Amino acid sequence: MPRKGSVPKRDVLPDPIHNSKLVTKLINKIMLDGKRGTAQRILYSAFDLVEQRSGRDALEVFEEAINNIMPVLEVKARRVGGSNYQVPVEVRPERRTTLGLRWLVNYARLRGEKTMEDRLANEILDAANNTGGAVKKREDTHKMAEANKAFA
Amino acid sequence: IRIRLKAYDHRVIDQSAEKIVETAKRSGADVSGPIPLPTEKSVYTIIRAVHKYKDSREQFEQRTHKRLIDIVNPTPKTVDALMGLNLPSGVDIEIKL
């Protein structure tokens, strides 16, 4: 009921390996077409190469990489007609978590290698080193919402 | 001995199972009582319209309620309920010996 009020948001189950809620939410977004096991195996083989190309354990590296993904301003369109109709609006903390996970996967699918064995882990170390393709569209949002700053 | 009790209604197959379990214990029987077999239903899905319309239809179903009665003390007083035909309305009895 999105006009009676708000929908009651539901609880998730954290990962057994990393003991993290954020890992399981990454499992569910890379779960293409309901296949839980065939996608979770790939994530469990896409942070070993993270822990191979950096000595730190990947549960530190994951929450360090997504901070170069998660933006702080975005654009919500208000129907003002002849105006710019693009208001720079800050991000709620729930959408702050989700939209970083979205960009991390959606540009992991457009790399040179075919296996998501290393399609995913390459973009994570790019996001760990504040570079790549999923970082550079955060700056594209931070050159679009931060250009039309006349609607704060 | 496996007296087969199957019928369309559920109020009738239950009251006719009470007949055969009563008219046997009065005789020298050791009746294993009525246990209910699972119902063998069947769904028929016709469409409602006279001429044209799918996407709006009425489903129909018919359910048979199956039970069985077995006795392992055959006396000539127990078979007086077997030879004695009662409640023939909407129940058939497949008497095996």
């Binding site: - | 019928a7 369309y8 309305s89 909407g90 129940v91 058939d92």
Partner: protein, 202 residues
């Protein structure tokens, strides 16, 4: 709207069957013998105040129960026409044993009679709104609770068909407790067919 008929909700829920037999093998052909003698009973009786029939079949002694709002007319003169019915009903099938008939009080509160006797008030072509009001006013006078009835097509003799219903009393068509009984007749007036529905309650 598309009101479905009120019996169809309630067959087995709050009602019973107009045929209460069983046949696992050869279910098809001996189901046709029912509506053989549902046409055939409706042929030669020809509104002998017959509401509806029941069929029960058991060990080649197949029963037929008729209600007959005018009792004795199917019996005849001390068991005359009831024995004159089994002289043909036992030939259209094999046995047809133990043909009988029971009686009902309140001859025009069963809806099969209420639809039929005012549908036959339409071949004489006299005052269909009073033909309505004759059925409504007599209904709770005789002991009913809710009454509802209409006439659909070629209404009054004109060209454009118009439904015309009259109602009072509690007629809960959506409540599954209710013993709603409806009927539909086929009153011809030699300019088409008039259709007439009724709805009685208690």
């Amino acid at each position: 709207g598309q009101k479905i008929n009120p019996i169809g909700l309630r067959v087995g829920i709050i009602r019973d069957w107009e045929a209460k037999w069983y046949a696992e093998k050869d279910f098809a052909s001996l189901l046709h013998e029912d509506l053989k003698i549902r046409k055939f009973i409706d042929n030669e009786l020809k509104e002998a105040s017959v509401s509806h029939v029941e069929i029960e079949r058991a060990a080649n002694r197949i029963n037929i129960a008729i209600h007959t709002g005018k009792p004795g007319m199917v019996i005849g003169k001390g068991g005359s026409e009831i024995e004159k019915l089994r002289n043909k009903l036992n030939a259209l099938t094999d046995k047809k044993v133990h043909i009988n008939v029971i009686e009902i009080k309140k001859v025009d509160l069963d809806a099969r009679l209420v639809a039929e006797n005012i549908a036959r008030q339409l071949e004489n072509r006299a005052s269909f709104r009073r033909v309505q009001k004759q059925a409504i006013t007599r209904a709770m006078k005789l002991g009913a609770k809710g009454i509802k009835t209409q006439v659909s097509g070629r209404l009054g003799g004109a060209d454009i068909a118009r439904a015309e219903q009259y109602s009072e009393g509690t007629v809960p068509l959506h409540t599954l407790r209710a013993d709603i009984d409806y009927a539909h007749a086929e009153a011809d007036t030699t300019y088409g067919k008039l259709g007439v529905k009724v709805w009685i309650y208690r």
